[PDB]
Design an enzyme around this catalytic site. Structure first.
Site, PDB file in Angstrom:
ATOM      1  CB  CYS B 108      -1.016   0.025   1.146  1.00 49.27           C
ATOM      2  SG  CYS B 108      -2.110   1.484   1.079  1.00 49.27           S
ATOM      3  CD1 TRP B 280      -7.480   8.809  -2.383  1.00 46.76           C
ATOM      4  CD2 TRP B 280      -8.573   8.952  -0.436  1.00 46.76           C
ATOM      5  NE1 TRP B 280      -6.633   9.388  -1.453  1.00 46.76           N
ATOM      6  CE2 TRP B 280      -7.283   9.496  -0.259  1.00 46.76           C
ATOM      7  CE3 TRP B 280      -9.459   8.940   0.656  1.00 46.76           C
ATOM      8  CZ2 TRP B 280      -6.846  10.042   0.965  1.00 46.76           C
ATOM      9  CZ3 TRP B 280      -9.030   9.471   1.887  1.00 46.76           C
ATOM     10  CH2 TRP B 280      -7.732  10.011   2.030  1.00 46.76           C
ATOM     11  CD  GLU B 285      -5.576   1.850  -7.054  1.00 43.78           C
ATOM     12  OE1 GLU B 285      -6.142   0.770  -6.744  1.00 43.78           O
ATOM     13  OE2 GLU B 285      -5.553   2.894  -6.336  1.00 43.78           O
TER      14      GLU B 285
HETATM   15  C1  HEM Z   1      -6.801   6.248   1.495  1.00 43.73           C
HETATM   16  C2  HEM Z   1      -6.425   6.049   0.229  1.00 43.73           C
HETATM   17  C3  HEM Z   1      -5.700   4.846  -0.270  1.00 43.73           C
HETATM   18  C4  HEM Z   1      -4.930   4.824  -1.382  1.00 43.73           C
HETATM   19  C5  HEM Z   1      -4.730   5.986  -2.340  1.00 43.73           C
HETATM   20  C6  HEM Z   1      -4.340   3.524  -1.466  1.00 43.73           C
HETATM   21  C7  HEM Z   1      -3.518   3.118  -2.518  1.00 43.73           C
HETATM   22  C8  HEM Z   1      -3.227   1.784  -2.783  1.00 43.73           C
HETATM   23  C9  HEM Z   1      -2.787   1.270  -4.028  1.00 43.73           C
HETATM   24  C10 HEM Z   1      -2.510   2.078  -5.264  1.00 43.73           C
HETATM   25  C11 HEM Z   1      -2.658  -0.068  -3.921  1.00 43.73           C
HETATM   26  C12 HEM Z   1      -2.224  -1.024  -5.022  1.00 43.73           C
HETATM   27  C13 HEM Z   1      -3.528  -1.592  -5.639  1.00 43.73           C
HETATM   28  C14 HEM Z   1      -3.465  -2.295  -6.972  1.00 43.73           C
HETATM   29  O1  HEM Z   1      -2.402  -2.283  -7.627  1.00 43.73           O
HETATM   30  O2  HEM Z   1      -4.494  -2.937  -7.400  1.00 43.73           O
HETATM   31  C15 HEM Z   1      -3.051  -0.395  -2.594  1.00 43.73           C
HETATM   32  C16 HEM Z   1      -3.030  -1.665  -2.096  1.00 43.73           C
HETATM   33  C17 HEM Z   1      -3.476  -1.927  -0.803  1.00 43.73           C
HETATM   34  N1  HEM Z   1      -3.866  -1.043   0.156  1.00 43.73           N
HETATM   35 FE1  HEM Z   1      -4.200   0.808  -0.075  1.00 43.73          FE
HETATM   36  N2  HEM Z   1      -4.633   2.822  -0.379  1.00 43.73           N
HETATM   37  C18 HEM Z   1      -5.536   3.496   0.346  1.00 43.73           C
HETATM   38  C19 HEM Z   1      -6.184   3.088   1.521  1.00 43.73           C
HETATM   39  C20 HEM Z   1      -6.077   1.827   2.099  1.00 43.73           C
HETATM   40  C21 HEM Z   1      -6.840   1.394   3.196  1.00 43.73           C
HETATM   41  C22 HEM Z   1      -7.896   2.204   3.910  1.00 43.73           C
HETATM   42  C23 HEM Z   1      -6.430   0.088   3.455  1.00 43.73           C
HETATM   43  C24 HEM Z   1      -6.861  -0.831   4.527  1.00 43.73           C
HETATM   44  C25 HEM Z   1      -7.504  -0.400   5.621  1.00 43.73           C
HETATM   45  C26 HEM Z   1      -5.422  -0.228   2.497  1.00 43.73           C
HETATM   46  C27 HEM Z   1      -4.795  -1.440   2.395  1.00 43.73           C
HETATM   47  C28 HEM Z   1      -4.236  -1.814   1.198  1.00 43.73           C
HETATM   48  C29 HEM Z   1      -3.933  -3.222   0.973  1.00 43.73           C
HETATM   49  C30 HEM Z   1      -4.114  -4.392   1.917  1.00 43.73           C
HETATM   50  C31 HEM Z   1      -3.453  -3.301  -0.273  1.00 43.73           C
HETATM   51  C32 HEM Z   1      -3.009  -4.601  -0.940  1.00 43.73           C
HETATM   52  C33 HEM Z   1      -4.176  -5.284  -1.693  1.00 43.73           C
HETATM   53  C34 HEM Z   1      -3.860  -6.668  -2.253  1.00 43.73           C
HETATM   54  O3  HEM Z   1      -2.753  -7.230  -2.025  1.00 43.73           O
HETATM   55  O4  HEM Z   1      -4.757  -7.253  -2.936  1.00 43.73           O
HETATM   56  N3  HEM Z   1      -5.186   0.861   1.733  1.00 43.73           N
HETATM   57  N4  HEM Z   1      -3.309   0.760  -1.876  1.00 43.73           N
HETATM   58  C1  LIG Z   2      -8.323   0.768  -0.236  1.00 42.72           C
HETATM   59  C2  LIG Z   2      -7.900   0.724  -1.677  1.00 42.72           C
HETATM   60  C3  LIG Z   2      -7.299   1.845  -2.243  1.00 42.72           C
HETATM   61  C4  LIG Z   2      -6.935   1.815  -3.590  1.00 42.72           C
HETATM   62  N1  LIG Z   2      -7.134   0.731  -4.327  1.00 42.72           N
HETATM   63  C5  LIG Z   2      -7.719  -0.389  -3.814  1.00 42.72           C
HETATM   64  C6  LIG Z   2      -7.994  -1.575  -4.731  1.00 42.72           C
HETATM   65  C7  LIG Z   2      -7.051  -2.727  -4.658  1.00 42.72           C
HETATM   66  C8  LIG Z   2      -7.395  -3.802  -5.664  1.00 42.72           C
HETATM   67  C9  LIG Z   2      -6.450  -4.973  -5.425  1.00 42.72           C
HETATM   68  C10 LIG Z   2      -6.740  -6.176  -6.301  1.00 42.72           C
HETATM   69  O1  LIG Z   2      -5.538  -6.945  -6.458  1.00 42.72           O
HETATM   70  C11 LIG Z   2      -5.672  -8.178  -7.160  1.00 42.72           C
HETATM   71  C12 LIG Z   2      -5.954  -7.880  -8.626  1.00 42.72           C
HETATM   72  N2  LIG Z   2      -4.626  -7.511  -9.083  1.00 42.72           N
HETATM   73  C13 LIG Z   2      -3.581  -8.139  -8.314  1.00 42.72           C
HETATM   74  C14 LIG Z   2      -4.346  -8.938  -7.253  1.00 42.72           C
HETATM   75  C15 LIG Z   2      -3.565  -9.184  -5.942  1.00 42.72           C
HETATM   76  C16 LIG Z   2      -4.348 -10.175  -5.119  1.00 42.72           C
HETATM   77  C17 LIG Z   2      -4.486 -11.481  -5.569  1.00 42.72           C
HETATM   78  C18 LIG Z   2      -5.228 -12.395  -4.832  1.00 42.72           C
HETATM   79  C19 LIG Z   2      -5.393 -13.819  -5.295  1.00 42.72           C
HETATM   80  C20 LIG Z   2      -5.846 -11.981  -3.659  1.00 42.72           C
HETATM   81  C21 LIG Z   2      -5.693 -10.658  -3.249  1.00 42.72           C
HETATM   82  N3  LIG Z   2      -6.310 -10.268  -2.112  1.00 42.72           N
HETATM   83  N4  LIG Z   2      -4.945  -9.780  -3.986  1.00 42.72           N
HETATM   84  C22 LIG Z   2      -8.145  -0.389  -2.487  1.00 42.72           C
END
Ligand code: HEM
Ligand SMILES: Cc1ccnc(CCCCCO[C@H]2CNC[C@H]2Cc2cc(C)cc(N)n2)c1
Ligand code: HEM
Ligand SMILES: Cc1ccnc(CCCCCO[C@H]2CNC[C@H]2Cc2cc(C)cc(N)n2)c1
Ligand SMILES: C[C@H](O)[C@H](O)[C@H]1CNc2nc(N)[nH]c(=O)c2N1
Ligand SMILES: C[C@H](O)[C@H](O)[C@H]1CNc2nc(N)[nH]c(=O)c2N1
Ligand SMILES: [Zn+2]
Lengths: 405, 404
Positions: B108, B280, B285
């Site tokens: 993140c 947000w 993205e």
């Molecule tokens: C407030 C504005 C936020 C922004 C701009 C932001 C931005 C991002 C971005 C750009 C990613 C990569 C997503 C992708 O490539 O699909 C991400 C991943 C993530 N963020 Fe945030 N984030 C925000 C808030 C949060 C919040 C509120 C949480 C949890 C309470 C969070 C937890 C995560 C997690 C766990 C991931 C990894 C998702 C995955 O592995 O599937 N973030 N964030």
């Molecule tokens: C809070 C927040 C702020 C900004 N963006 C987001 C959206 C995050 C979307 C993350 C989706 O990630 C998915 C789709 N692309 C790689 C993949 C990573 C992944 C894979 C798998 C199997 C599970 C998982 N939880 N995450 C959430």
């Protein structure tokens, strides 16, 4: 499944398993506790013989004579030589094989589809700094080839017990000077401040331009390095123009044709070639994105954005992104117009995907460093971004080594 | 050994000591680095020690480390595990743990915001209907007419006996993807499987490019239930370009609220299988991945043709140029609609400040370089030039199996 890492391409859904990594005999910087993959530089008779035996085994496999009599004879010959002298020496064809294999093994190189096509100049007879210069000039002439670039490496004598090393002090054969100003700024390339100052300490009369080609500092064993000016007609450069932005040419930007790394150590079967400069051709982003747009390099983004009349007072105009694209386009266009080999980051990454498939079949894997392979602009627009990679150290290898001073 | 961590633009150096707090192994070994993998293949006493560690984190966070309240809370947790094999968090601990799970998330880039998280406790939820009510309030709250506010809703924890509470959808807002007999996809190819599960569980499908899916919500050991989100709760932004007039004709749009709904939240050894969270978007993205990935909406070519670019050769940089305009259109369109968004330069600049804050506060920050660096203009952002150390701290958000 198999107990080897599973490697997925998320664009295509396809899966492979890397078995090649089992051959790694050298640890990288990562542990189960923490990944250090993004660090640029993460910090003997029985041992030599085992690296040499391994390498001779690699050689005999490559020519399909493993277990042959010539294979067992070479092994014995290597242990005898090490036995009586503490070192050994490669056959000509072993050096060619090892040099290519080091390239093929380099995880940070996106151009490895070309790995089989490398001219290896054997310069292990070199005995002076002046002769190194001749060898280097010949290398530059051959490789440049009036713009139709050819990959090459020149290998100078190996490291020897208690005798000093052959070294090229410059990080590349072509480098633009970086002159420190009284106000603390830099004219020219800030990457090259140190080498620039070392050239001046060793008697070089400095220029004062932004694109002054540096001389070479060449060091033969147990001697001070000697200074050598490249005849300008050997150094092909490309003035930069843009295909439709007519003012771009007025900026007076340029880059050199030949990317020739000169500060890396080539390791083969435990033998260490401390001076083994190698060259290929540029991927356009190296020049147009990193060298010209890094804040700590020529840093021209703002200047170009102002000429394009962009809103540079706010991030959300995407002024940086727009300017960088035009500077990359200018690099491509200018090299094409000048008929000098170059490859764009789309074509290069497509070709690396082909390489990964070729290597899956030939060797069951390919060591690759994702952060280095994905280009610095337009990352996810290239197929390599969507491709998982496994990074590990195989030998023969190119390694970083300390600066000689 | 504590890693030295260098910024190559500024030449500054730190040492990460926070990694010593990791009790959870990643996929790397000294023989090979697997840092680029999206999901690598990976009792009372063990719960008790994760529980104690977490309670210590909490009392330290409120500065009351070693107090009466601290020691009695440890005894309660111990008494509960010893008797029942499990325990329960106090709401204040839950709120601390959720913020810490975000703070700890290495993928993140948005973590400068980590302290600002609205936590809705939904642990008194006993049915799919009830989960829907909570999710609707989460959406209303977080959306806030475009002035987006970060939030998490925490449904009941996993329990040894029984099935999990789960939201089947990967986010609360997803566009349908309709597979064709001729193989191709109408809508979002990322959502073909979920779209099909919805239909099979009774949904009447649309046939557009941007049909908002219903939620499949599951209470323990029951078939999932289908709920349609009221259109009024789902804020969307029509995409137009500030100068290219034809761009609006493409009929493109995206939703305001990124709310991830398939990840497991782990606090103190307890596991919250349904704990949707939202913030947000960062513009890339939408503008880069969602619209330009070849396995997503894949619109690059269409845009490039509309721009009359030369598409027959890579070296015209038509892809790059079209991607940039698409990202610009997303930013322009969110701004015009007054919906919160952040561009990739502003976000990475904020993350650099976060790294510095975290260095002073905790002696490091776990971060996954491949995910932090944006998918366009990587080296034009400060994070490209920043070395990063990646490791798992708890509390954490984790991936978990799909429930079907
Ligand atoms: C407030 C504005 C936020 C922004 C701009 C932001 C931005 C991002 C971005 C750009 C990613 C990569 C997503 C992708 O490539 O699909 C991400 C991943 C993530 N963020 Fe945030 N984030 C925000 C808030 C949060 C919040 C509120 C949480 C949890 C309470 C969070 C937890 C995560 C997690 C766990 C991931 C990894 C998702 C995955 O592995 O599937 N973030 N964030
Ligand atoms: C809070 C927040 C702020 C900004 N963006 C987001 C959206 C995050 C979307 C993350 C989706 O990630 C998915 C789709 N692309 C790689 C993949 C990573 C992944 C894979 C798998 C199997 C599970 C998982 N939880 N995450 C959430
Ligand atoms: C034929 C065309 C070639 C292309 C287009 C090419 C492309 C590249 C690129 C783009 C990089 C990244 C450099 C950076 O970001 O600064 C690189 C690194 C490298 N390539 Fe190549 N390559 C080529 C040929 C070669 C050859 C001929 C060798 C050796 C014989 C080689 C060995 C390397 C090595 C060792 C690195 C890593 C350098 C370091 O870590 O400092 N490559 N390659
Ligand atoms: C053969 C070929 C083809 C295309 N491009 C090239 C040029 C590669 C230039 C490599 C420069 O790498 C330097 C400068 N930026 C990161 C850094 C990596 C590095 C660091 C150190 C200490 C040593 C070293 N050998 N390599 C060479
Ligand atoms: C910190 C980070 O490892 C560093 O900036 C890397 C990232 N990727 C790179 N990739 C290439 N090809 N060349 C580089 O110099 C770098 N720099
Ligand atoms: C294979 C590679 O790890 C994968 O494509 C990653 C790369 N970096 C990413 N970075 C972010 N922010 N989101 C992603 O989905 C990905 N995908
Ligand atoms: Zn690693």
């Amino acid at each position: 499944g198999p107990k080897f890492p599973r490697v997925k391409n998320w664009e295509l859904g396809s899966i492979t398993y890397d078995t090649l990594c089992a051959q790694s005999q050298q640890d990288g910087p990562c542990t189960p506790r923490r990944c250090l993959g993004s660090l640029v530089l993460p910090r003997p008779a029985e041992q030599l013989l085992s690296q040499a035996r391994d390498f001779i085994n690699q050689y005999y496999s490559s020519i399909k004579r493993s277990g042959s009599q010539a294979h067992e004879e070479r092994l014995q010959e290597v242990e005898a030589e090490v036995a009586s002298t503490g070192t050994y020496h490669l056959r000509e064809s072993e050096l060619v094989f090892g040099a290519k294999q080091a390239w093929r093994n380099a995880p940070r190189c996106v151009g490895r589809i070309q790995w089989g096509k490398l001219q290896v100049f054997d310069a292990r007879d070199c005995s002076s700094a002046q002769e190194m210069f001749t060898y280097i000039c010949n290398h530059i002439k051959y490789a440049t080839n009036r713009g139709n670039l050819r990959s090459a490496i020149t290998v100078f004598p190996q490291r020897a017990p208690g005798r000093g090393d052959f070294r090229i002090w410059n990080s590349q054969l072509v480098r633009y000077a970086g002159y420190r100003q009284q106000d603390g700024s830099v004219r020219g390339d800030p990457a090259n401040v140190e080498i620039t100052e070392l050239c001046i300490q060793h008697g070089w009369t400095p220029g004062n331009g932004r694109f002054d080609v540096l001389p070479l500092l060449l060091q033969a064993p147990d001697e001070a390095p000697e200074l050598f000016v490249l005849p300008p007609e050997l150094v092909l450069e490309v003035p930069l123009e843009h295909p439709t932005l007519e003012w771009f040419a007025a900026l007076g930007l340029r880059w050199y044709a030949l990317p020739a790394v000169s500060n890396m150590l080539l390791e083969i079967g435990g033998l260490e070639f401390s001076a083994a400069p190698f060259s290929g051709w540029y991927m356009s982003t190296e020049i147009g994105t990193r060298n010209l747009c890094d804040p700590h390099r020529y840093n021209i983004l703002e200047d170009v954005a102002v000429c394009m009349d962009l809103d540079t007072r706010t991030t959300s105009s995407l002024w940086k992104d727009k300017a960088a694209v035009e500077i990359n386009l200018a690099v491509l266009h200018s090299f094409q117009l000048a008929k000098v080999t170059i490859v764009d980051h789309h074509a290069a990454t497509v070709s690396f995907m082909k390489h990964l498939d070729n290597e899956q079949k030939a060797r069951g894997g390919c060591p690759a460093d994702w952060a280095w392979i994905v280009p610095p602009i337009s990352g996810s627009l290239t197929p390599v971004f969507h491709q998982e990679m496994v990074n590990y150290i195989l030998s023969p290898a190119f390694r970083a080594q300390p600066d000689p001073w």
